[PDB]
């Protein structure tokens, strides 16, 4: 007989990244208007500029 349903494109709820990501704000449907997170080189095992 004629084929009515033979599957199709399947929508996925989630996109799970497999790579470690740097901290970030919202950039999709929600756009964070605040300043992006500040990166600080805080903990140093050896003195650099002191």
């Amino acid at each position: 007989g004629e084929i009515i349903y033979d599957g199709g494109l399947s929508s996925k709820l989630a996109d799970v990244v497999d790579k470690t990501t740097e901290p970030h704000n919202a950039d999709g449907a929600v756009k964070d208007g605040r300043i992006a997170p500040v990166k600080l080189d805080l903990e140093k095992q050896k003195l650099d500029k002191l």
Binding site: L13, A14, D15, E22, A29, V30
Partner: protein, 251 residues
């Protein structure tokens, strides 16, 4: 306090750099007045602005200020007209939620109002900041929730053919830093009500659905009398005088 002084100085520079870029907001006449002591015009304006903070001088509200205040108020009040909303709902496909059936869409993502209760129980409400920080999002999303405390920008295009109503991208993206909602774009199709293939595709292929409040820009064709509006144009007999001076220059 040091924080207040630092905050004021940074803001003052940001304002000054903005008002002197491109065509300056301030005219060359007053820049001459403030430069007469030798200081730079940009520096003189910064000094004058600081003195003016906290003034009680009355300022007359001009017509252009009234117009923009009206547009600003309607921008906040009627968000659906401009393509953003403050609330979205994610539900599994097997949960039946009441939707707007006025337009004849297939699996319409538009609800007249986001339901207070579903299946006799109130719908959970989670803010975007808490949602982004969640690590058990899989368990929470199985029951469906409502996301608020954010401004969600959405787009849609209505297709005249019939097909499976869906989103361009996935609903959410999960990262080791946090969870986010991908840009929202709806492909909306009209429904034939008797296509078995499209009924099966909608029920089984798509597992989760996103719902937003019905945009107010849309209006069914049957209610075309609601677009009937009036506009008043002044009479054509008027003549507008460019130079309203009342006297000439001669002794």
């Amino acid at each position: 306090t040091s924080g207040s002084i630092i905050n004021h100085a940074n803001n003052l520079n940001k304002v000054i750099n903005h008002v002197f870029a491109d065509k300056p907001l301030i005219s060359e006449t007053m820049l001459k007045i403030l430069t007469i002591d030798g200081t730079t015009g940009k520096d003189g304006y910064r000094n004058w602005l600081d003195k003016l903070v906290g003034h009680n001088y009355p300022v007359y509200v001009e017509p252009v200020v009234n117009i923009m205040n009206f547009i600003s108020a309607r921008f906040v009040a009627d968000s659906s007209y401009f393509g953003y909303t403050n609330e979205i709902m994610i539900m599994p496909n097997h949960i039946n939620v009441p939707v707007d059936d006025r337009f004849g869409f297939r699996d319409s993502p538009f609800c007249t109002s986001l339901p207070r209760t579903i299946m006799g129980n109130d719908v959970r409400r989670i803010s975007y900041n808490v949602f982004s920080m969640m690590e058990d999002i899989d368990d929470v999303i199985s029951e469906g929730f409502i996301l608020y405390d954010a401004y969600f920008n959405f787009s849609y295009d209505i297709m005249t053919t019939d097909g499976v109503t869906r989103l361009k991208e996935d609903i959410l993206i999960v990262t080791d830093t946090g969870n986010d909602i991908k840009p929202i774009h709806f492909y909306i199709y009209f429904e034939n009500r008797n296509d078995k293939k499209l009924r099966y595709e909608s029920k089984m292929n798509v597992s989760y659905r996103l719902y937003i409040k019905t945009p107010a820009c849309l209006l069914p064709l049957s209610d075309y009398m609601r677009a009937q509006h009036d506009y008043v144009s002044p009479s054509s007999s008027r003549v507008y005088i460019k130079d309203p001076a009342v006297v000439y220059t001669r002794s």
